[PDB]
A paper describes a structure:
[name] is abundantly expressed and forms a dimer that mimics the structure of a slightly bent 20 base pair B-form DNA and blocks the DNA binding grooves of the type I RM enzyme, preventing the degradation and modification of the T7 genome by the host. Our results with purified components show that [name] can bind to RNAP and inhibit both σ70 and σ54 dependent transcription. Using structural biology, we show that the [name] dimer directly binds to RNAP at the RNAP cleft, where sigma factors and the transcription bubble bind, suggesting that [name] interferes with transcription recruitment by competing with sigma factor binding, and could also interfere with transcription initiation. During 3D classification, it is clear that a number of different conformational and structural classes exist within the dataset and two distinct classes were identified due to their widely differing RNAP clamp conformations.
In both of the distinct RNAP-[name] complex structures, [name] remains as a dimer upon binding to RNAP and the [name] dimers are slightly less bent compared to that of an [name] alone crystal structure. The second structure involves only one of the two [name] subunits within the dimer contacting RNAP, occupying only the downstream DNA channel. Here the RNAP clamp is less open and we denote this structure the ‘narrow clamp structure’. In the narrow clamp mode, the proximal [name] subunit interacts with the β’ clamp, again mimicking downstream DNA in RPo although the clamp is more open (~45 Å) compared to that in RPo (~35 Å). Interestingly, although an [name] monomer surface mimics that of a dsDNA in the overall dimension and the negative charge distributions, the [name] subunit in the narrow clamp structure does not exactly overlay with the downstream dsDNA in RPo when RNAP is aligned on its bridge helix, the highly conserved structural feature that is close to the active centre and connects β and β’ clamps. Instead [name] is shifted upwards compared to the dsDNA in RPo. The downstream binding channel of RNAP consists of β and β’ clamps on two sides and the β’ jaw domain as a base, providing a positively charged environment on three sides, required to accommodate and engage with the negatively charged DNA during transcription. Although an [name] monomer has a largely negatively charged surface, there are also positively charged patches on the [name] surface, especially those facing the β’ jaw domain. In order to maintain the interactions between [name] and the β’ clamp and to overcome charge repulsions with the β’ jaw, the β’ clamp is opened up, shifting [name] upwards and away from the jaw domain. When the clamp is closed as in the transcriptional open complex, even though there is ample space to accommodate one [name] subunit, the charge repulsion between the β’ jaw domain and the [name] surface results in the opening of the β’ clamp, thus shifting [name] upwards and away from the β’ jaw domain.
Numbering used by the authors:
A (entry chain C): 797 to 945
B (entry chain C): 548 to 696
C (entry chain E): 1 to 75
D (entry chain D): 14 to 1049, 1058 to 1067, 1075 to 1088, 1097 to 1126, 1133 to 1376
E (entry chain G): 5 to 108
F (entry chain C): 1244 to 1341
G (entry chain F): 5 to 110
Write the structure that this text describes.
């Protein structure tokens, strides 16, 4: 930790039994500013029918959110995700829906359910802000992930 | 879950977690070392009749059950002559006053009764034991700071 | 006027338990509509207005029954 | 819709089910898995239960559903009753009606079985191998006998034609229709009147009461056998316990299609006219399908469930899957309440707290939406959702309009009592943590170290009224269990007012002739400190010499500056003698207590807030620090330690002597080091004087120091001597769970440097004290669980109690000095019509009054001995309690109102002490012995004494000893108030002669537990007995005989030359003399010596009412009682001769002590003192008074060992809840030697004596069984046994036909309704009045 | 296997003991009934605990001196089963003496 | 903590609340008795059915707060109805009286 | 027979407690087990003598510290069910933690 100048006195009530009163200069020095690095673990489900690769170009997304992503659904190194921003593009595979007599216009617009009904993006649950650090896409023997990695 | 006086320099009585299991996890002390059979042995230096030999041995519980162990805080000059007629000592764990030549062992340093977790706290005499345990439970978790003073 | 204790309203009708339901059935008509408060608001909610109307001793069971029969006869 | 008040569970009629649903069902093609379309009629599909999607029908015609009451092709047209889903169920048609298994097996054969026939034969004849013949006659056999195949073949061969016997339950229906219920009840009452077998009594009473349940239920028992059964809805099914499926692929569908398939196969084979074995196999498989559908059909241990048998029992999904504990036990969607870290806020007066910004922006999101809809700022809902996301200024304006005068609840997770949740007012605080009011920490029982508190938002207007009317912190000032005020300053305001009202000698500023007084202005400007000397300032003061007015006076008084500033805080003239001293915890707490007693409730809250504000603002100006100069070392301390170890060396010389053993050396080491600790404590207390002084010398005390540790030790808020002695001086002994300690304790302190062994041994004290926290939490929760589970059916329902009889209030204490005065017990409860002065024809109250402090002052300035108090049980109230005896309700000031929940505050008052008692009062040593010198029984206070249950024993000396067992002492203090309960031993040696009284000195008793009062009254030698071996093997001048292994009583010798009183047997008797020795009266003849209160299991033993280790047998009305009284051959102490007959002769197994020697005539209620007393016998013979006093005084003797104080009202409420199950003696109208409710017994006695009868049903005795059946004595099925099997309770309440009739508090928690307590009882009374008004 | 099965088993064993020993005195029933208390109780702990789940037996004690002093659980509940069975078998043995004097 | 009214909740608001992974429970078993000790009926009524264990009741209360009606509509919503459908499934029924 | 229902109820309540209290470690995850040990145990002697008669629970103890020392049998029989439930639910808690990180698509 770090040491500070301590005054041993009872204050106006801000220290009741063992409470702590601090100064504003500690905030001014950016002191003990914690840096929490969490994991974004993406998933690409493989079903009995349909392709297996999760790609870019997901519809029902505004152009303000698509500008911070590179190809194949990855953001640039140094871009800030704040709450509901898209860090990785979640893709449901094109199976389970091609043998459907109904919903042809939905397959023309937002085909094979590329997004959910009403959910947030798959970066962090809401209430956060911060930039990306490092992307760790690791490949398989014979998988063709050259354009993303 | 209680403390036996064999726990002098083998493990520490301080470092226990703050959960329900308190008393059963004993962290190993600084100078203790596992013997070739598997038991813990803390070092003791040899005390002769006139001088004090600087070599050290590793003593087990069965050996110290019949041997005599002096305290850590006792007077010693440069040569090794005992200037105190009645040095406060112990035989089997409980402190009792012996003579100047009835002991043949001596603690190396005043560190064996505490492990590496609570050795960072100055003045452990002047703090309560449960509060030293609480300070250990404070030192067991801390995020790193940017300045690191 | 932030009300501290409703005990002065208990001095009029002493039960400590009728006061909640009486203030509720008085304030539903002001919350939904079709009624005007007899006491002007001091920049508060209708709860403090109901506590002060019970505290002033203007509304009880009899006045609520007479006004209920009047609103049933007028409708 | 309507409500649910009192509905029985009577048997569903077949006509009611045919009127419930009407139609025909064939060919059960229910669910086709490949179509998912609305199919035909079927059973339990989309054709029944109306439509499957909300407002449409697919039938082919008439989808609008104009008409009602037809099933045309494939849909349900008839609704006619309720909404779409809550409509009728349906029906199945059985060709052979099978009986219900819950009557056939009621765990085991409880209700639904008895017909003077065993269970095994009825189980056999319902199988395939046996049957019961019906409508017989003119033979040797009867209709109740059992038959096999060959026996029934011989029966049909002998009987010929007109033989009827069916395999199913139709023969049971015909047998039940043939048997008349009234004639069977008459025959069973005749068999109860004629027979005398004790096992037959309970069986015949169960038969008579079950048949009376059938008669006064008004229903046919043949409805128990299922003929037409309704089905349950498909969406009533929850999901499967395995992985997620659908509602059509559930576990119930296979059993349903199996039952319907066997029903249709039975219909097809009866239309085909199958032979006998085929139709009996069909009826057997149908009965097996019904019995497997209803329950699991277990017979014994049920060793293994058959690979998770899918929905084996309906009762398992009623009790376990859906959950009998459905409401308020799992937690159920807290819904806009959340947690955060609690911080302190040094502002926001008591009915206000803080709330974080980003939390309060989210907590009122629908309120923000509604007010943006109301103000017209947001057009649509998505516009409001965008305006929340933008976080602009007008959203914060609307949020400030929301939080402005709206309440909230703060609620910690441990709520052991009611003040754990408190209502406040939120104010926006920057950050994510919650600022709390500083003084609410003792009610929360937690410190500010990151403890959490849920923030419950009142969502309805009535919840806002509940928060601002009942749950505020300003509504509750006193505690709801003691009467002590709960808001107490803790070491901040206390230290501020201690430094404020501290005096000094020769400070700056002297002779302050001031007006206003305004002593703060010269403190603020210059030249005046707040700790100045005695100056004479003018202090005005109000008094209450006029009733309802204020009398102002004016006087100049010698005081300090801080007291003159503190008088500006005080409103409306409190008495000056309470602020003219040093302020600690006791002084400030007593100031707040007297402010609450005098000024009421409105001035004391602003007084407490302003005291807190000035304590904070002057403790900030104080600036107390803890330095190395504050901690002091005694100058003689090492010398004392040297003296201590010198004495140890002397004991060590005794350790080399051989005169002192190990335990004696241990006790001497403990005594020497404890004396050294006391000497260094007194040396430290002497050395705390004259450390930091003002410029003054030559005085006596020389300027008592201003260091922080002595201020904290003298203030007494948190600084106690037991931790100042551990800071400075000597720490002393430690605590080890093994029970031992070292022989050379810690000599140094935390000021000096300790050794490594000293810290290694001092770690054991923390190891002993740390394990107390985690233990006994679940046990303390389970005790409160059972105390709520036994006492939930009590609410206040009336206004006046209407009695003259009540529990007599007598002032009793423990041994030694006074513990609790009478004025604490008289305050509170409403007294009776008569209180008496020692002067005749003098009264105080006409009938009754509200007892507050003025009546306590009237009783204090006068003389009072005993107070008659209106109280519990006596004058019982139907359907609740009137509770007029429950006066001066705690934490409020008013008369008691109706609808107050009583009983759930009782368990919180009993459960409020902590996890473990601390009664060691010292270190691990102390040398606690039995008796140092003597037992020391004497009187202390003045007044004449009266001895109870004593005799006149003839002695040679002037003193007169007694040989009685129980002896009481009565003391005169005011008018007969004792206030000294000295436990006199059995037959104590009295140094004072009997019949004389003295006050002051002259200790009358000197008892030593080595003697025994067995003496001779007449002078003469010892009666000659036979000395034989065998009786000298007894245990704790030689002994001669023994009455235990066989001193028996013989004739006393009355002459010195002739060989010629009553000697009781204590159990151990050793003869101390020789036969033939001249001895005088009052000398040693033969002497040898031979309840348990306190503890946390002792509280469980009190409130479970278990039988003790040694039960007591009391004495009834007068009969000749004496030793022997014609004892039998074995099993001694049988009292046969009783004058006045009274044929009641008990048989004792000889384990008990000899009962009486004096008292040849006795009374009902005499004590026998056979160890512990039996409360059930005192309840049967003495009454409610002695049992109530016994339980309440034992609870108080448990509570006084730790210092906790709980008023006796809650304990007497629990005693009232434990006095159900009243058993009768005289047979009444609808009862005969059974136990029923007390309120129903009072209703039956009132209906007997009201109109026609003289006295039918009287002289009933109560029971005190305790916790098991009294919690099960709730006569509503919704909380009869909620923990136990549900359908087991439902079958009993179905056949019995019992009503709920709305008494209970957990009942509308399990069901879910407005509870009849608080403001819910007001809604109940308003509905009951608007029902009668129209 | 409920409390009524153990009750009927103790009833049958008491009938067999009265038929074997031929006891017509009330004081001489000490050697039989306790043996009827001894052979009616089960040895398996689940067979002990299955009886307690049914009605007919309670947890309250008539005499506290019959309970032994142990730290376990099964001994106290087993002695409670012995006490309840003996309390049943006294009033059963009275009626069985009546039926034995009126049978043969 | 303190999640809001979110979608995809069939009972007790347990799936998909406002958190990382959310679940709605622990009002407590002693706090219910504390509300009984105050004599709180409507707060306990919210703890029973409307705020706690009703799907339609949350929508009705949301419409009352947003539309400005502020109507509680007291009674026994859809829990005692489930109790009636589970009790009357057997051979015993429940009548309706005063 | 009845111990399986108590086991399934304790598993469901412990899964809901870890779902609600959303903690993601194995050192501090014990208060949800204290929720399961204090709620899922039966109250009075009927189910307590009924559950222990069924299979799944034994009389012998795994840890010596959790055994109570009293003369009342009902406290020891309740602490028996509590201790056996904690021992049988530790591994199931860790298994549902292993299933818990990728269960709900969020």
């Amino acid at each position: 930790g770090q040491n500070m100048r301590v005054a041993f006195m009872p204050w106006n009530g801000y220290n009741f039994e063992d409470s702590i009163l601090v100064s504003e200069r500690v905030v001014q020095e950016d002191r003990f500013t914690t840096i929490h690095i969490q994991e974004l673990a993406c998933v690409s489900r493989d079903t009995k029918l349909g392709p297996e690769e999760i790609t870019a170009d997901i519809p029902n997304v505004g152009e303000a959110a698509l500008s911070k992503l590179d190809e194949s659904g990855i953001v640039y190194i140094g871009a800030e995700v704040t709450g509901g921003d898209i860090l990785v593009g979640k893709v449901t595979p094109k199976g389970e829906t091609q043998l459907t007599p109904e919903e042809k216009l939905l397959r023309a617009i937002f085909g094979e359910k590329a997004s959910d009904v009403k959910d947030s993006s798959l970066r962090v649950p809401n209430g956060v802000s911060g930039t990306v650090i490092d992307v760790q896409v690791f490949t398989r023997d014979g998988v063709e992930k050259d354009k993303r990695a | 879950r209680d403390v036996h006086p064999t726990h002098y320099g083998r493990v520490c009585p301080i470092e226990t977690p703050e959960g329900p299991n308190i008393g059963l996890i004993n962290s190993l002390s600084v100078y203790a070392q596992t013997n070739e059979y598997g038991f813990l042995e803390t070092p003791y230096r040899k005390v002769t009749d006139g001088v004090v030999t600087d070599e050290i041995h590793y003593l087990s519980a069965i050996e110290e059950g019949n041997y005599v162990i002096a305290q850590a805080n006792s007077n010693l000059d440069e040569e090794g002559h005992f200037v105190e007629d009645l040095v406060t000592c112990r035989s089997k764990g409980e402190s009792s006053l012996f003579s100047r030549d009835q002991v043949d062992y001596m603690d190396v340093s005043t560190q064996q009764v505490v492990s590496v977790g609570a050795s960072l706290i100055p003045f452990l005499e002047h703090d309560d034991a449960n509060r030293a345990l609480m300070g250990a439970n404070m030192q067991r978790q801390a995020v790193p700071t940017l300045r690191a003073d | 006027m932030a009300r501290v204790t409703v005990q002065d309203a208990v001095e009029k009708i002493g039960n400590r338990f009728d006061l909640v339901l009486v203030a509720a059935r008085r304030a539903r008509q002001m919350q939904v509509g079709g009624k005007d408060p007899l006491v002007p608001e001091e920049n508060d909610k209708t709860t403090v207005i109901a506590l002060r109307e019970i505290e002033e001793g203007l509304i009880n069971n009899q006045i609520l029954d007479v006004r209920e029969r009047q609103e049933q006869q007028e409708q | 819709t309507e409500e649910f008040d009192a509905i029985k569970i009577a048997l569903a009629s077949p006509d009611m089910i045919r009127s419930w649903s009407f139609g025909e069902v064939k060919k059960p093609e229910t669910i086709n898995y490949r179509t998912f379309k609305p199919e035909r009629d079927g059973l339990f599909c989309a054709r029944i239960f109306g439509p499957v999607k909300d407002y449409e029908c697919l039938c082919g015609k008439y989808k609008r559903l104009k008409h009602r009451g037809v099933i045309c092709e494939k849909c349900g047209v008839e609704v006619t009753q309720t909404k779409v889903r809550r409509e009728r169920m349906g029906h199945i048609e059985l060709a052979s009606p099978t009986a219900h298994i819950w009557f056939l097996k009621s765990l085991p054969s409880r209700i639904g079985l008895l017909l003077d026939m065993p269970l095994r034969d009825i189980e056999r004849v319902l199988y395939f191998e046996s049957y019961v013949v019906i409508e017989g006659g003119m033979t040797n056999l009867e209709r109740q006998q059992i038959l096999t195949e060959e026996q029934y073949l011989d029966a049909l061969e002998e009987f010929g034609d007109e033989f009827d016997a069916k395999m199913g339950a139709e023969a049971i229906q015909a047998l039940l229709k043939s048997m008349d219920l009234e004639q069977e009840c008459e025959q069973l009452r005749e068999e109860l009147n004629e027979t005398n077998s004790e096992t037959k009594r309970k069986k015949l009473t169960k038969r008579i009461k079950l048949l009376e349940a059938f008669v006064q239920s008004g229903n046919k028992p043949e409805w128990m056998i299922l003929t037409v059964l309704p089905v349950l809805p498909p969406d009533l099914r929850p999901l499967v316990p395995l992985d997620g499926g659908r509602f059509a692929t559930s576990d119930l569908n296979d059993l349903y299609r199996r039952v319907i398939n066997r029903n249709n196969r039975l219909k097809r084979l009866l239309d085909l006219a199958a032979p006998d074995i085929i139709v009996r196999n069909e009826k057997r498989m149908l009965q097996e399908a019904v019995d497997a559908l209803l329950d699991n059909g277990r017979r014994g241990r049920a060793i293994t469930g058959s690979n998770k048998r899918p929905l084996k029992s309906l009762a398992d999904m009623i009790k376990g899957k859906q959950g009998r504990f459905r409401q308020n036990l799992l937690g159920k969607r807290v819904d806009y309440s959340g947690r955060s870290v609690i911080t302190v806020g040094p502002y926001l007066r008591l009915h206000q707290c803080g709330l974080p910004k980003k939390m309060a922006l989210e907590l009122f999101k629908p309120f923000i939406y509604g007010k943006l809809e109301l103000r017209g700022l947001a057009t649509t809902i998505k516009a409001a959702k965008k305006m929340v996301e933008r976080e602009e200024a007008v959203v914060w304006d609307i949020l400030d309009e929301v939080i402005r005068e709206h309440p909230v609840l703060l609620n910690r997770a441990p709520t052991l009592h009611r003040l754990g949740i408190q209502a406040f007012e939120p104010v926006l605080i920057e950050g994510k943590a919650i600022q709390l009011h500083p003084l609410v920490c003792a009610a929360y029982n937690a410190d500010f170290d990151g403890d959490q508190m849920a923030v419950h938002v009142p969502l309805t207007l009535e919840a806002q009224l509940e928060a601002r009317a009942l749950m505020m912190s300003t509504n509750n000032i006193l505690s709801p269990a003691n009467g002590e005020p709960i808001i107490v300053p803790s070491q901040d305001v206390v230290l501020g007012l201690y430094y404020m009202t501290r005096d000094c000698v020769n400070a700056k500023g002297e002779g302050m002739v001031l007006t206003g007084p305004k002593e703060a202005e010269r403190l603020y400007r210059s030249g005046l400190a707040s700790l100045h000397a005695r100056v004479k300032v003018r202090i005005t003061e109000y008094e209450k010499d006029a009733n309802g007015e204020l009398v102002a006076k004016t006087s100049l008084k010698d005081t300090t500056v801080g007291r003159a500033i503190l008088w500006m805080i005080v409103p409306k003239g409190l008495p000056y003698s309470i602020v003219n001293q040093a302020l600690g915890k006791k002084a400030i707490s007593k100031m707040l207590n007297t402010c609450y007693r005098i000024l009421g409730l409105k001035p004391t809250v602003i007084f407490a807030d302003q005291i807190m504000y000035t304590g904070f603002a002057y403790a900030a100006r104080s600036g107390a620090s803890v330095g190395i100069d504050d901690m002091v070392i005694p100058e003689k301390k090492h010398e004392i330690i040297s003296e201590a170890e010198a004495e140890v060396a002397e004991i060590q010389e005794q350790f080399q002597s051989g005169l002192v053993t190990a335990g004696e050396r241990y006790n001497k080491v403990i005594d020497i080091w404890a004396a050294a600790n006391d000497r260094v404590s007194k040396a430290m207390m002497d050395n705390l004087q004259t450390e930091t002084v003002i410029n003054r010398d030559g005085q006596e005390e020389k300027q008592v120091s201003f260091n922080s540790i002595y201020m904290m030790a003298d203030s007494g808020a948190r600084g106690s001597a037991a931790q100042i002695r551990q800071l400075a001086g000597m720490r002393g002994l430690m605590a080890k769970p093994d029970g031992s300690i070292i022989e050379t304790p810690i000599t140094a302190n935390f000021r000096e440097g300790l050794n490594v062994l000293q810290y290694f041994i001092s770690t054991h004290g923390a190891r002993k004290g740390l394990a107390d926290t985690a233990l006994k939490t679940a046990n303390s929760g389970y005790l409160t669980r059972r105390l709520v589970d036994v006492a939930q059916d009590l609410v206040v329902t009336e206004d006046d109690c209407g009695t003259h009889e009540g529990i007599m209030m007598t002032p009793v204490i423990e041994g030694g000095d006074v513990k609790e005065p009478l004025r604490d017990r008289v305050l509170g409860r409403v007294t009776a019509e008569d209180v008496l002065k020692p002067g005749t024809a003098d009264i105080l109250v006409p009938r009754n009054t509200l007892l507050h402090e003025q009546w306590c002052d009237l009783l204090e300035e006068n003389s009072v001995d005993a107070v008659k108090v209106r109280s519990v049980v006596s004058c019982d109230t139907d359907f609740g309690v009137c509770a007029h005896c429950y006066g001066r309700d705690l934490a409020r000031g008013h008369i008691i109102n109706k609808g107050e929940a009583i009983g759930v505050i009782a368990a919180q008052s009993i459960g409020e002490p902590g996890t473990q008692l601390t009664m060691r009062t010292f270190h691990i040593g102390g040398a606690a012995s039995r008796a140092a010198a003597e037992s020391s029984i004497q009187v202390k206070n003045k007044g004449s004494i009266k001895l109870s249950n004593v005799k006149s024993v003839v002695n040679s000396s002037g003193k007169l000893v007694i040989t009685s067992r129980n002896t009481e002492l009565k003391l005169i203090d005011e008018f007969g108030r004792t206030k000294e309960s000295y436990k006199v031993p059995y037959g104590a040696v009295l140094a004072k002669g009997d019949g004389e009284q003295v006050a002051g000195g002259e200790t009358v008793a000197n008892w030593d537990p080595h003697t025994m009062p067995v003496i001779t009254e007449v002078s003469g030698f010892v009666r000659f007995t036979d000395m034989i071996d065998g009786q000298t093997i007894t245990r704790q001048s030689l002994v001669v005989l023994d009455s235990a292994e066989r001193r028996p009583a013989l004739k006393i010798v009355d002459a010195q030359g002739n060989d010629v009183a009553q000697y009781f047997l204590p159990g151990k008797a050793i003869v101390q003399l020789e036969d033939g020795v001249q001895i005088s009266s009052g000398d040693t003849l033969a002497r040898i010596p031979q309840d348990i209160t306190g503890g946390l299991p002792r509280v469980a033993d009190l409130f479970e009412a278990r039988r003790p280790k040694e039960p007591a047998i009391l004495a009834e009305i007068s009969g000749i009682v004496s030793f022997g009284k014609e004892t039998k051959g074995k099993r001694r102490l049988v009292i046969t001769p009783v004058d006045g007959s009274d044929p009641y002769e008990e048989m004792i197994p000889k384990w008990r002590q000899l009962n009486v020697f004096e008292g040849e005539r006795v009374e009902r209620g005499d004590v026998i003192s056979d160890g512990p007393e039996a409360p059930h016998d005192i309840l049967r013979l003495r009454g409610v008074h002695a049992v109530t006093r016994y339980i309440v005084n034992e609870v108080q003797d448990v509570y006084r060992l730790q210092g906790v104080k709980i008023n006796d009202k809650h304990i007497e409420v629990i005693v009232r809840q434990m006095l159900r199950k009243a058993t009768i003696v005289n047979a009444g109208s609808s009862d005969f030697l059974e136990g029923e409710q007390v309120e129903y017994s009072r209703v039956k006695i009132a209906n007997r004596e009201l109109e026609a009868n003289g006295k039918v049903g009287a002289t009933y005795s109560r029971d005190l069984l305790g916790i098991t059946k009294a919690s099960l004595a709730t006569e509503s099925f919704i909380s009869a046994a909620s923990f136990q099997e549900t359908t087991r309770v439902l079958t009993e309440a179905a056949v019995a036909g019992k009503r709920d009739e709305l008494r209970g508090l957990k009942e509308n928690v399990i069901v879910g309704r407005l509870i009849p307590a608080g403001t819910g009882y007001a809604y109940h009374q308003d509905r009951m009045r608007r029902r009668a008004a129209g | 296997m409920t409390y009524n099965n153990v009750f009927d088993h103790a009833y049958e064993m008491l009938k067999e003991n009265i038929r074997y020993d031929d006891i017509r005195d009330t004081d001489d029933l000490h050697d039989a009934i306790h043996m009827a208390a001894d052979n009616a109780v089960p040895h398996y702990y689940a067979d002990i605990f299955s009886v307690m789940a049914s009605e007919g037996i309670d947890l309250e004690f008539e005499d506290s001196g019959l309970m032994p002093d142990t730290k376990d659980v099964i001994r106290i509940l087993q002695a409670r089963i012995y006490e309840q069975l003996t309390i049943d078998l006294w009033e059963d043995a009275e009626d069985l003496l009546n039926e034995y004097l009126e049978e043969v | 903590h303190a999640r809001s009214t979110g979608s995809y909740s069939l009972v007790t608001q347990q799936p998909l609340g406002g958190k990382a992974q959310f679940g709605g429970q622990r009002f407590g078993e002693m706090e219910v008795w504390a509300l009984e000790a105050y004599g709180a009926a409507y707060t306990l009524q919210e703890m029973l059915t409307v705020k706690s264990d009703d799907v339609n009741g949350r929508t009705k209360m949301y419409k009352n707060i947003v539309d400005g009606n502020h109507q509680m509509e007291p009674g026994m919503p859809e829990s005692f109805n489930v109790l009636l459908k589970e009790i009357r499934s057997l051979g015993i029924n429940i009548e309706l009286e005063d």
